[PDB]
Design a protein around this ligand. Structure first.
Ligand code: ZN
Ligand code: ZN
Ligand code: ZN
Lengths: 149, 102, 86, 102
């Protein structure tokens, strides 16, 4: 089971709209839902040279927060999201350990505010090591966890 | 002209402020005006349904206030409720994935 | 300023499998829905991986012929797909 | 449908009006078609019911039981006892009832 995600319009148009045409593609080859392919590549001309890159999930919401206001408070926000918190223990461990993410405040039970900071980080701290970022844990760890299974 | 009530609720929508602004304004003003009678009742039903279409009005605010709207549902006559369910289906089927409960 | 501020990624957790079209095994007697049954041995039809002995057309309630028919003969309402038995 | 309605009329968990409702629809399924063999077995099982003697068309089931050629009189009797969708003459000449009477 995964959490409940809002899935915005671009996410909608990527997948759901696809579901429309998918009926056109396959009529009779039905759907088993898989969100995982939500794709994202950013070509941004913030600075003279369009850059194609990939980044994390939260600040996008922050960007949305910025368009509307400066902040999105966690109370209403939490009211809106309601993630299924099965995985949350592992998630919390990862978010706390990383500290690469520009966040408002990482508390144990509830993070009171999710109106995250600006682009604080670049690829690495050091060159020998102390290298590690994008957020790795979900990625190789799944089998690591799954071994029992 | 008949565009007066639509113009008033459109002026109450013309605020480019936060989601808290538009959401609080339409929660209070259309909890007032939905529970009225007549053309302002009908247009408040339509304008609350149309106010809960956004993604800036993020979805379980829309879902929760539409659960609240489905609890306010017996305050309404039947034909206005019919048109509510028509236009509300018309807003759901864009994001019916998000509003399967609705 | 604004060069990498966390917009759309590919992200994967575990979803599926095996799928959730059910689709079920002709349950009156339940040789596997790929498997050629006894009732399709004297018949020996080219049978689909979801067709043990299944014809859901107008006949619509078609399981293992004499076993679905034995569930048919003692009372003619054979209710799993709810029609007469093939 | 005859076995459906009859053995729903014999069960005792259901309301009594609903038992005799299933029973009278089993009598509808008696008269509307002509007798197949297990059908006729269920019709004679219906003939052993005092509640069917409480029904309006027990004389029709009686003439079914006594192997009687149905004349127009009791024909029109149970034709007064039908529902109008069960009175369907869908371009078959005489009705499904009446062709089965023949
Ligand atoms: Zn076999
Ligand atoms: Zn067979
Ligand atoms: Zn099969």
């Amino acid at each position: 089971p995964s959490s409940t995600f809002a899935i915005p319009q671009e996410l909608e148009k990527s997948v759901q709209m696809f579901e429309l045409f998918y009926s056109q593609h396959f009529s009779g080859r039905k759907l088993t839902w898989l969100h995982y392919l939500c794709t994202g590549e950013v070509k941004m001309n913030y600075l003279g040279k369009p850059y194609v890159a990939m980044v994390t999930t939260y600040q996008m919401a922050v960007l949305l927060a910025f368009n509307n206001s400066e902040t999105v408070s966690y109370k209403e926000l939490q009211d809106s999201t309601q993630m299924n918190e099965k995985e949350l223990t592992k998630t919390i461990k990862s978010l706390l350990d990383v500290k690469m993410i520009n966040h408002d405040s990482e508390k144990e039970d509830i993070d009171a505010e999710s109106s995250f900071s600006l682009n604080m980080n670049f690829s690495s701290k050091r060159t020998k090591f102390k290298i590690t970022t994008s957020m790795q844990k979900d990625t190789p760890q799944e089998m690591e966890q799954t071994r029992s299974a | 002209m008949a565009a007066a009530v639509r113009q008033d609720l459109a002026q109450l929508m013309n605020s480019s402020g936060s989601h808290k602004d538009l959401a609080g304004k339409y929660r209070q003003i259309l909890e007032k005006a939905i529970q009225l009678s007549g053309a302002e009742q009908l247009e408040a039903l339509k304008a609350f349904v149309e106010a809960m279409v956004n993604e800036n009005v993020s979805l379980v605010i829309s879902r929760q206030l539409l659960t609240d709207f489905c609890t306010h549902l017996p305050n309404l006559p039947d034909s206005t409720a019919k048109e509510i369910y028509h236009f509300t289906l018309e807003k759901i089927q864009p994001r019916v994935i998000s509003f399967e409960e609705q | 300023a604004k060069k990498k501020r966390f917009e759309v990624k590919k992200w994967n957790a575990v979803a599926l499998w095996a799928w959730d079209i059910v689709v079920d095994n002709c349950a009156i007697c339940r040789n596997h829905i790929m498997d050629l049954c006894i009732e399709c041995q004297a018949n020996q039809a080219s049978a689909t991986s979801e067709e043990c002995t299944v014809a859901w057309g107008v006949c619509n309630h078609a399981f293992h012929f004499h076993c679905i028919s034995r569930w048919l003969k003692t009372r003619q309402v054979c209710p799993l797909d709810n029609r007469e038995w093939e | 449908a005859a076995q459906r309605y009859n053995e729903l009329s014999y069960k005792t968990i259901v309301h009594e009006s609903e038992r005799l409702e299933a029973l009278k629809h089993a009598l509808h399924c008696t008269i509307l078609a002509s007798a197949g063999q297990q059908r006729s077995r269920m019709l004679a099982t219906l003939f052993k019911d005092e509640r069917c003697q409480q029904l309006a068309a027990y004389g029709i089931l009686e003439k079914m039981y006594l192997d009687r050629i149905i004349r127009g009189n009791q024909l029109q009797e149970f034709a007064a006892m039908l529902m109008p969708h069960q009175k369907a003459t869908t371009a078959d000449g005489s009705s499904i009832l009446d062709r089965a009477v023949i």
